Design an enzyme around this catalytic site. Structure first.
Site, PDB file in Angstrom:
ATOM      1  N   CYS A  32     -16.552   3.154   1.855  1.00  0.00           N
ATOM      2  CA  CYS A  32     -16.858   3.350   0.439  1.00  0.00           C
ATOM      3  C   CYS A  32     -17.777   2.279  -0.092  1.00  0.00           C
ATOM      4  O   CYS A  32     -18.595   2.526  -0.966  1.00  0.00           O
ATOM      5  CB  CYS A  32     -15.592   3.492  -0.421  1.00  0.00           C
ATOM      6  SG  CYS A  32     -14.132   2.283  -0.033  1.00  0.00           S
ATOM      7  N   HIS A  54     -12.304  -5.213  -5.403  1.00  0.00           N
ATOM      8  CA  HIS A  54     -11.887  -3.910  -4.898  1.00  0.00           C
ATOM      9  C   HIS A  54     -10.458  -3.567  -5.289  1.00  0.00           C
ATOM     10  O   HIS A  54      -9.583  -4.429  -5.226  1.00  0.00           O
ATOM     11  CB  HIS A  54     -12.062  -3.888  -3.370  1.00  0.00           C
ATOM     12  CG  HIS A  54     -12.071  -2.514  -2.769  1.00  0.00           C
ATOM     13  ND1 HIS A  54     -10.944  -1.724  -2.692  1.00  0.00           N
ATOM     14  CD2 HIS A  54     -13.069  -1.802  -2.188  1.00  0.00           C
ATOM     15  CE1 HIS A  54     -11.250  -0.582  -2.098  1.00  0.00           C
ATOM     16  NE2 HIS A  54     -12.528  -0.607  -1.776  1.00  0.00           N
TER      17      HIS A  54
HETATM   18  N1  LIG Z   1      -8.662   4.727   0.093  1.00  0.00           N
HETATM   19  C1  LIG Z   1      -9.971   4.676  -0.141  1.00  0.00           C
HETATM   20  O1  LIG Z   1     -10.464   4.494  -1.448  1.00  0.00           O
HETATM   21  C2  LIG Z   1     -10.914   4.823   1.021  1.00  0.00           C
HETATM   22  C3  LIG Z   1     -12.292   4.947   0.803  1.00  0.00           C
HETATM   23  C4  LIG Z   1     -13.139   5.242   1.870  1.00  0.00           C
HETATM   24  C5  LIG Z   1     -12.595   5.407   3.140  1.00  0.00           C
HETATM   25  N2  LIG Z   1     -11.237   5.284   3.347  1.00  0.00           N
HETATM   26  C6  LIG Z   1     -10.709   5.466   4.729  1.00  0.00           C
HETATM   27  O2  LIG Z   1     -10.151   6.767   4.933  1.00  0.00           O
HETATM   28  C7  LIG Z   1      -9.075   6.702   5.868  1.00  0.00           C
HETATM   29  C8  LIG Z   1      -7.774   7.158   5.211  1.00  0.00           C
HETATM   30  O3  LIG Z   1      -7.679   6.466   3.990  1.00  0.00           O
HETATM   31  P1  LIG Z   1      -6.531   6.709   2.907  1.00  0.00           P
HETATM   32  O4  LIG Z   1      -6.747   5.735   1.805  1.00  0.00           O
HETATM   33  O5  LIG Z   1      -6.538   8.168   2.635  1.00  0.00           O
HETATM   34  O6  LIG Z   1      -5.221   6.225   3.736  1.00  0.00           O
HETATM   35  P2  LIG Z   1      -3.749   6.864   3.525  1.00  0.00           P
HETATM   36  O7  LIG Z   1      -2.668   5.960   3.990  1.00  0.00           O
HETATM   37  O8  LIG Z   1      -3.560   7.236   2.113  1.00  0.00           O
HETATM   38  O9  LIG Z   1      -3.837   8.157   4.491  1.00  0.00           O
HETATM   39  C9  LIG Z   1      -3.297   8.235   5.792  1.00  0.00           C
HETATM   40  C10 LIG Z   1      -2.552   9.560   5.891  1.00  0.00           C
HETATM   41  O10 LIG Z   1      -2.585  10.026   7.220  1.00  0.00           O
HETATM   42  C11 LIG Z   1      -1.311  10.498   7.615  1.00  0.00           C
HETATM   43  N3  LIG Z   1      -1.119  10.275   9.072  1.00  0.00           N
HETATM   44  C12 LIG Z   1      -0.708   9.133   9.728  1.00  0.00           C
HETATM   45  N4  LIG Z   1      -0.685   9.386  11.058  1.00  0.00           N
HETATM   46  C13 LIG Z   1      -1.086  10.662  11.271  1.00  0.00           C
HETATM   47  C14 LIG Z   1      -1.248  11.429  12.428  1.00  0.00           C
HETATM   48  N5  LIG Z   1      -0.758  11.007  13.592  1.00  0.00           N
HETATM   49  N6  LIG Z   1      -1.683  12.738  12.309  1.00  0.00           N
HETATM   50  C15 LIG Z   1      -1.951  13.283  11.065  1.00  0.00           C
HETATM   51  N7  LIG Z   1      -1.784  12.518   9.929  1.00  0.00           N
HETATM   52  C16 LIG Z   1      -1.363  11.230  10.028  1.00  0.00           C
HETATM   53  C17 LIG Z   1      -0.297   9.800   6.714  1.00  0.00           C
HETATM   54  O11 LIG Z   1       0.822  10.613   6.443  1.00  0.00           O
HETATM   55  C18 LIG Z   1      -1.092   9.467   5.461  1.00  0.00           C
HETATM   56  O12 LIG Z   1      -0.843  10.367   4.392  1.00  0.00           O
HETATM   57  C19 LIG Z   1      -9.005   5.250   6.318  1.00  0.00           C
HETATM   58  O13 LIG Z   1      -9.768   5.108   7.502  1.00  0.00           O
HETATM   59  C20 LIG Z   1      -9.616   4.481   5.163  1.00  0.00           C
HETATM   60  O14 LIG Z   1     -10.104   3.209   5.528  1.00  0.00           O
HETATM   61  C21 LIG Z   1     -10.395   5.000   2.305  1.00  0.00           C
END
Ligand SMILES: NC(=O)c1ccc[n+]([C@@H]2O[C@H](COP(=O)([O-])OP(=O)(O)OC[C@H]3O[C@@H](n4cnc5c(N)ncnc54)[C@H](O)[C@@H]3O)[C@@H](O)[C@H]2O)c1
Ligand SMILES: NC(=O)c1ccc[n+]([C@@H]2O[C@H](COP(=O)([O-])OP(=O)(O)OC[C@H]3O[C@@H](n4cnc5c(N)ncnc54)[C@H](O)[C@@H]3O)[C@@H](O)[C@H]2O)c1
Ligand SMILES: NC(=O)c1ccc[n+]([C@@H]2O[C@H](COP(=O)([O-])OP(=O)(O)OC[C@H]3O[C@@H](n4cnc5c(N)ncnc54)[C@H](O)[C@@H]3O)[C@@H](O)[C@H]2O)c1
Ligand SMILES: NC(=O)c1ccc[n+]([C@@H]2O[C@H](COP(=O)([O-])OP(=O)(O)OC[C@H]3O[C@@H](n4cnc5c(N)ncnc54)[C@H](O)[C@@H]3O)[C@@H](O)[C@H]2O)c1
Ligand SMILES: O=P(O)(O)OC[C@@H](O)CO
Lengths: 334, 330, 330, 330
Positions: free
Chosen positions: D149, D176
């Site tokens: 992001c 952040h």
């Molecule tokens: N949060 C942000 O603002 C942001 C911005 C850009 C990128 N990202 C990236 O996106 C990715 C996810 O981010 P997030 O904030 O949504 O994290 P999050 O913790 O909210 O999402 C992870 C989800 O994946 C699920 N999960 C875990 N293991 C799994 C598996 N074995 N199979 C299927 N599902 C599984 C969990 O239940 C959880 O809901 C990360 O790589 C993060 O760095 C996040």
């Protein structure tokens, strides 16, 4: 045997009294027209950020009584009407934020004060940051001085060490700063700063400072070579400066780390501190230093372009320095 | 169409304004505060809690242009000086928090307004109206009060429970979002010492008349309810936690059914009902002044129960101020 | 001294440890967790809520050294593989949250320890003890539980009020700090859907056993109290809100008299009493497991009252865990 | 219509999902997390940051129904067992944080899908794409990454700044918001010790390769930028604070003119431009991945300047993930 009067019993004024209790500095009087003795007791005894006062706080015969030491309470709107003369002509800590000019803070001198420390930037009063330029104090010509901002007391000791050792050609500062009394709980009116009225707890708020320019005043070689800004964030206390600078002489991040450590251990002990631990903001809640260098939080692009990080408890470090400076001023009386 | 002037362009003033844009019966003609027109435009455009204003806003010749309609902006500290007649205002929404007696509110009528709705509990015998409880007891009076946000949440729930099961007695707590009277860091609140302490750091006990005030809008419950508040570090949305002794035995299913039928029936739009796993941000922007939380509540036995209802202290109350304005102008 | 071993260096484990250093009867000799010795040192030294460790901490070689004393560091997932005897541990403070049955907790006994105190309510027939409530009913059992932080608050107050005025019935709400089990932003919490929602953003309704569990440690109150929780965005310190119907009529002044008498008498250091204008941060670091707030409470009449008591969910409970260790090994 | 499958239904997966609803060119035909389908509906319906879901969601025969559209729900821990082809998924959005290498992500292609978009920076040499930076460089690779992001905020800004004035060198800070990886109270994070410290209580220094990563999607800026982060207690929206040395001298107004030209032309929809006194919440819901804040910035001189740009780390990023999916299907 310095005697201090405090004008304004807010965050700085209450915490100044605390550091004075801690050091045996006699506070003889507090003036605040909006807080009465009973209410001073409550505001001093309980603190959300720095905890309960360790000691006793009572009120007796219109006096604040802290650890059995009686303190007179005044209730005057104007510095020139406060009875400083009746309580032995103390040095006054001007902590209202309302009397910031030499002319304004001099009212305390009319009413019997010996010296005034303005606990904020002054448009005309001399700034004096301990560790940097307190020797600029002239007891013969200065009865009103300014102890600068909290941010200035963080940036200056760091900026001194780095300029002397490596030369700052230019720098841009950001302080990520806790919210303060001037901000609002929910979006509200702030005529002179529209962003600063938006709810403090919900928002990252871009904000102004003259802290980096002010360093050019207390370290005259840095005049015109630093500026900056601020972001106010949802924390109640403890702030951090983020200094990005071009160095004249190339310097590894290890050389820089060693220079700061040096100063911390010798000539700026008690003012500048040095850590390599995985610290966060609450780790300096109640920290007495003006600037705590965070070795591991910083990053160098090259030997001439670095980003330095230092912490400061904007309340309690700054109060400590007010008490340091007035003790220093008192030591210089001819 | 009913012409409204807002005095005090704070949280209630600004949310009442937005809600009035979504109605055709009411148009905001004038606004008073101690602020410039361009600053008002800013405070309207952007809201930390409720997002950006849906529509256009501009300043032109020292007046607002909101969705293309010119709003008069004035900056009078004294309501008597407000010249509401020059804009032809029917009812003033009095939302400064400063003019909650007949004596003070009446300066708006002196200034050319027909009627005044106070956006808070009145500090004298000025009559109070809560929708779902007593709107229909409005007897033509020229100065009224819409009570508090908390009463508007409690009254409808109380009325439904009492009418079905009979409240012998009740005590109430509200866990209430932070408001504008609180302080960011520990500062002076010489009228409420606890309320001067850092809002975002603390659970802070507070007094409230809201439960006694239910006795004024529902006289049958006079002397039977009281309570208090805890202010907590949330910027909006509050919750009522009502512990009631019931005259008539009622299963928690029977209590659920009572509220649900009132929600869909005679209290539609006022009282809401849910059985979802809800938290407070789920009611940010809610128009109902009381949304019963079925799963959250809990009975000890058929005659002693704890009931919980959500309310958006800003949005719901503000909508009902416009509702009260529209009612007294019928 | 009584040699204690800590399983799980979480919030309770760490506060238990810090409180242990002020005691002359108790010495912590080993900690077990999924943590490097350097990381345990870091977590002990620095604390967001309770400030810096008052004492010295080093990792030499190493080898956790605190206040000059060597602490054994292990990283065994299976409690059965701990060899508590190899450092001479009598009592194990079980504070992982994962071993709250006699079956699981007993793995420490086979790993060489003598007794076990669970730092949380037992999920089986394992007996629970709360100081000021039933510590003196300890009959030499080798595995016990210290209840919950909330039960440690309510039971003491409940008994004083029952003993003096008799509780016919009560419903309870705890307005409660956020804990380690909650999420920073809306996340997965399949056994508790509301509890997955943004901790900092929300008032979250939450179900608690702590009011019913008062019935276990005060059998005279079985089936007479139940209640629930609102989790709120504060990092420590919670408050209990007890609405009670009383057998014997009682003025608030008589309720106060009784609470204060018990606070200065048989429940000294467990039950506290204040008339100040206190807020939550004022009980950060509070050792008393229940601190009565005279001014916060309210009575409808002499038989129906709402009583408010504070507790530092972390600190007070950790102190009473250590008291339970001292007591079971007398 | 490009069919897509979301693996991982956390913050990004869910907001990507909500963003796809407003697109015609994309259908979300399937979701895989580790949650029952009803729990998945609950998490979709209600959102602490973004309000209630605009539309209907239902669960029938273990499949989500969203605005009358069936969605396959699975719970396969291993992306190998996902049978993406039994729903006709063209592209899968990899949103778990776990499979950020070719080898791990390629399992989706093995399980039937054609191409994959990682919703984080790749941990190997999987090529990264950032709209307004290098989308046009895409060569048909079946596995890609939308970077982070912060790179999505920084790169468009840096391109314009470099294209007009020439970045000699730049150091970046991102203030952040709190993310899922953080802890509500002081907890374990042996990867990142500062990152375990209570998110609501602290300013938390944190590292990022977001600034380095700009030099991958903009090779002309390789070796010229780096930076870091401070995590703060806000639930969403972040800001980039970029300090750059310029080759060509430019006044602050010249820099404003340049960014405003790009935001209105070349970078429309990616880079935005404001001169209003904005704060973080003003960008909750912002779809532009970088919004220049004209009044926040500051110049020391024509060749040395601190620039400021906002991004909703959830919404802007989720939107460009769909833009990347769209682009690679073209
Ligand atoms: N949060 C942000 O603002 C942001 C911005 C850009 C990128 N990202 C990236 O996106 C990715 C996810 O981010 P997030 O904030 O949504 O994290 P999050 O913790 O909210 O999402 C992870 C989800 O994946 C699920 N999960 C875990 N293991 C799994 C598996 N074995 N199979 C299927 N599902 C599984 C969990 O239940 C959880 O809901 C990360 O790589 C993060 O760095 C996040
Ligand atoms: N809070 C910080 O982080 C901090 C740090 C460094 C410097 N300062 C400076 O210190 C000054 C005060 O700041 P604070 O945070 O303590 O503010 P504060 O709002 O907490 O306190 C101000 C106090 O002044 C009193 N007061 C107002 N008018 C008065 C008058 N006419 N006479 C006597 N008392 C009066 C008020 O009752 C109040 O208690 C400001 O100039 C500020 O910039 C504050
Ligand atoms: N915010 C809520 O959740 C809520 C709910 C129900 C009732 N209320 C009531 O509504 C009233 C206002 O509350 P609020 O939350 O909007 O507070 P607020 O601070 O946001 O609003 C007060 C406004 O009045 C203005 N003002 C002050 N003096 C004035 C003057 N004499 N003339 C014109 N304007 C003046 C201020 O500039 C400010 O904008 C209060 O009586 C409060 O009890 C608030
Ligand atoms: N924190 C409170 O307000 C509070 C109050 C009363 C009771 N409790 C109870 O205390 C217990 C711990 O809670 P906490 O708040 O300290 O949470 P926590 O997350 O801070 O503690 C759990 C700790 O146990 C460790 N752990 C996990 N698995 C382990 C394993 N198998 N072996 C060794 N260590 C392991 C984790 O690393 C973590 O540090 C719970 O049973 C809870 O009910 C907590
Ligand atoms: O905004 P104020 O209240 O002056 O705070 C002083 C200092 O913390 C920085 O300015």
């Amino acid at each position: 045997m310095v005697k201090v009067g405090i004008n304004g019993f807010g965050r700085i004024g209450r915490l100044v009294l605390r550091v004075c209790m801690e050091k045996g500095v006699r506070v003889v009087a507090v003036n605040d027209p909006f807080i009465d003795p009973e209410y001073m007791v409550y505001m001093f005894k309980y603190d959300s950020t720095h905890g309960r006062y360790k000691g006793t706080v009572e009120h007796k015969n219109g006096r604040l009584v802290v650890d059995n030491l009686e303190i007179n309470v005044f209730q005057c709107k104007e510095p020139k009407e406060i009875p400083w003369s009746s309580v032995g002509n103390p040095y006054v800590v001007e902590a209202t934020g309302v009397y910031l000019s030499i002319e304004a803070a001099s009212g305390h001198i009319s009413s019997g004060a010996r010296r005034v420390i303005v606990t904020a930037p002054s448009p005309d009063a001399p700034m004096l940051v301990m560790g940097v330029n307190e020797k600029d104090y002239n007891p013969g010509s200065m009865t009103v001085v300014s102890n600068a901002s909290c941010t200035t007391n963080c940036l200056a000791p760091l900026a001194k060490v780095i300029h002397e050792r490596f030369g700052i050609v230019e720098g841009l500062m950001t302080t990520v700063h806790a919210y303060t009394a001037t901000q609002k709980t929910v979006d509200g009116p702030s005529k002179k700063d529209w962003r600063g009225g938006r709810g403090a707890h919900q928002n990252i708020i871009p904000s102004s400072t003259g802290a980096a320019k002010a360093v050019g005043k207390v370290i005259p070689e840095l005049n015109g070579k630093l500026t900056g800004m601020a972001f106010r964030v949802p924390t109640p206390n403890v702030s951090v400066v983020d200094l990005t600078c071009r160095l004249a002489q190339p310097a590894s991040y290890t050389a820089i780390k060693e220079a700061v450590k040096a100063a911390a251990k010798g000539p700026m002990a008690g003012i500048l501190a040095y850590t390599e631990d995985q610290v966060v903001s609450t780790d300096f809640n109640g920290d007495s230093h003006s600037s705590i260098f965070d070795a591991k939080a910083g990053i160098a692009l090259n030997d001439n372009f670095v980003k330095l990080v230092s912490w400061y408890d904007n309340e309690y470090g700054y109060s400590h320095r007010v008490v340091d400076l007035l003790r220093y001023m008192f030591s210089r009386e001819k | 169409t009913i012409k409204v002037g807002i005095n005090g362009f704070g949280r209630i003033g600004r949310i009442v304004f937005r809600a009035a844009q979504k109605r055709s019966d009411i148009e905001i003609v004038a606004i008073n505060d101690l602020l410039d027109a361009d600053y008002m435009a800013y405070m309207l455009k952007y809201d930390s809690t409720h997002g950006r204003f849906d529509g256009t806003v501009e300043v032109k010749d020292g007046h607002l242009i909101v969705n293309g309609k010119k709003i008069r902006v004035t900056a009078e500290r004294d309501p008597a000086n407000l010249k509401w007649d020059e804009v032809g205002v029917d009812v003033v929404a009095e939302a400064t928090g400063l003019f909650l007696t007949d004596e003070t509110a009446r300066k708006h009528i002196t200034a050319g307004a027909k009627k005044v709705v106070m956006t808070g509990p009145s500090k004298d015998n000025t009559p109070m109206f809560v929708k779902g409880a007593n709107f229909d007891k409005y007897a033509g009076q020229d100065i009224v009060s819409n009570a508090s946000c908390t009463t508007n949440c409690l009254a409808p729930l109380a009325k439904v429970i009492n009418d079905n099961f009979g409240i012998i007695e009740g005590l109430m707590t509200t866990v209430h979002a932070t408001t504008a009277t609180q302080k960011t860091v520990d500062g002076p609140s010489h009228k409420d010492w606890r309320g001067g302490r850092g809002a975002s750091q603390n659970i802070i006990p507070s007094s409230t008349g809201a439960a006694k005030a239910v006795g004024k809008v529902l006289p049958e419950l006079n002397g039977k309810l009281t309570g208090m508040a805890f202010r907590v570090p949330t910027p909006n949305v509050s919750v009522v936690d009502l512990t009631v002794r019931l005259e008539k035995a009622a299963t928690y299913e029977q209590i659920k059914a009572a509220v649900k039928a009132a929600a869909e029936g005679e209290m539609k739009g006022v009282l809401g009902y849910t059985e979802d796993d809800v938290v407070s941000t789920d009611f940010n922007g809610e128009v109902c002044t009381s949304v019963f939380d079925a799963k959250a509540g809990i009975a000890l036995n058929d005659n002693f129960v704890k009931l919980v209802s959500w309310y958006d202290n800003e949005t719901g109350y503000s909508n009902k101020v416009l509702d009260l304005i529209a009612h007294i102008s019928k």
